[PDB]
């Protein structure tokens, strides 16, 4: 699974991206609880989360080769 | 290499946009750009820095452009966002819309930039002389 | 030799006037093109020729301007249009305003385009293989 | 006084502009009587008069040098 940081979130952890190997898929919510346990420091962040380049909710499932994105409040325009 | 609806890091050619929109059935365009302003604080802005996961915000452009053919027929859209360092009154964002007539042309184009503030993943941070802020909304 | 309300014979050459309009302050710009249309007859437009009472015409785009300024204060608007022999798809007339926010940008950029229309000493041709006519309104 | 003639009032009288030598002023509906008294080819022709590059009504005077122009009906845009 690749994991894609953007804006604050990628200035909090000092790393656009990052590899997590996963053995079989994982529900959006379990990639946040991941995600929250190693990087308390964004715990309070907002974001969306996208799979694939399309946005996806919590109760969504995300494969072991799935490209995963932090989208935090847009600000373009 | 010119995309109907792309992410470009280099200063926005403008002429490209409006010439892709047009053919002979088309008799007006409208082009909006969005401009990095000044003053907009108390402390000056020295440049912003915009941020976008391309692959997809050029998805998301195009879902716009497919938003406005289903409500605005016989228009054609183009839309380009520049990311990296803007400085002061660089071009940001550019939409561009032809149609046969002006009414359709310019609700159009407003609809798109409406719509790119909302759904599209790009990000601007503020950089000003001993600090910098990534903007919401 | 440009001016910020001109009338030209040459064709018109877009990015100087958006680049008239723009400064620090202005976070908008609206820029209109109206173009020559194919097949609005039955029988195949070749060409259309413009005329205007230069002049004049000049001095009735900076009343629009003045107008402009009057209705929506900010705004910084350029105005050209363009005479003799246009091709389909030329350029005829092009709008440009200014603004610090878009909205006041697209409304009188779209004011601008009903006044030349209502008030502008400038005149069409329509040519078609054997016949032509000066249009009205 | 100098006449300027613009669109289909040019291309019916062939010509764009002449010159009328004046002695004194002329009222614009004076103007329009002589115009077509001339040119009865254009005497049901639609158009405003501009005088120095100003609208002016039927009751306004046109000096002797001024320049004087046929405006039919626009069409820019």
């Known amino acids: ?23 079989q898929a994982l529900t959006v919510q379990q990639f946040e609880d991941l995600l929250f346990e190693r990087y308390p420091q964004i715990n309070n962040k907002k974001f969306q989360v996208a799979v694939n380049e399309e946005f996806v909710q919590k109760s969504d499932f995300i494969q072991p080769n799935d490209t995963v994105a932090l989208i935090p409040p847009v600000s373009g325009g | 290499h010119m995309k109907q609806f792309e992410i470009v890091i280099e200063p926005i050619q403008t002429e490209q946009y409006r010439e892709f929109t047009i053919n002979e059935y088309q008799g007006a365009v409208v082009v909006f750009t969005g401009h990095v302003r000044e003053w907009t604080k108390g402390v000056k802005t020295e440049y912003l820095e915009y941020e976008a996961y391309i692959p997809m915000a050029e ?7 497919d938003e ?12 380009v966002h520049r990311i990296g360092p803007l400085q002061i009154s660089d071009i940001a964002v550019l939409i561009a819309v032809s149609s046969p007539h002006r009414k359709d042309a310019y609700r159009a184009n407003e609809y798109a930039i409406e ?23």
Chains 1, 4 share one sequence.
């Not at chain 1, 699974?1 to 053995?23: G, R």
């Not at chain 2, 998805?59 to 452009?65: F, S, V």
């Open chain 1, 1 to 23: 699974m690749k994991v894609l940081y953007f804006a604050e979130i990628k200035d909090i952890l000092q790393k656009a991206q990052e590899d997590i190997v996963l053995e």
């Open chain 2, 59 to 65: 998805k998301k452009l195009a879902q716009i452009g």
């Open chain 2, 115 to 137: 719509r790119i503030k909302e759904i599209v993943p790009i990000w601007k941070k503020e950089i000003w002389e001993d600090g910098s802020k990534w903007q919401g909304h």
């Open chain 2, 68 to 79: 406005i053919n289903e409500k605005w027929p016989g228009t054609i859209t183009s839309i």
